[PDB]
């Protein structure tokens, strides 16, 4: 689906916009980096919108640890 899924409004403060986006992380070129939040049935969020530093994002991508976005991170599991 190449871009479908990338241009969503991932959270109430989402800054990623198909009409304004530019690369931020060293791994980005033409699309925003994203990470899967395991809360409930799960959902995708833009890593930048979560204020995730690059190394944190990369480490998460290189492991099996589940990630929980800022909106759901405090919810009793």
């Amino acid at each position: 689906s190449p871009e479908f899924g990338y241009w969503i409004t991932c959270c109430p403060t989402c800054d990623v916009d198909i009409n304004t986006w530019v690369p931020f992380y060293s791994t980005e070129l033409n699309k925003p980096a994203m990470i899967y939040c395991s809360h409930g049935d799960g959902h995708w969020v833009h890593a930048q919108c979560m204020d995730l530093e690059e190394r944190t994002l990369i480490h998460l991508s290189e492991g099996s640890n589940k990630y929980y976005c800022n909106e759901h991170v405090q919810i009793a599991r």
Partner: peptide
């Protein structure tokens, strides 16, 4: 965690 656009270039 599953991610997108995190592969080194």
């Amino acid at each position: 965690a599953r991610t997108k656009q995190t592969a080194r270039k």
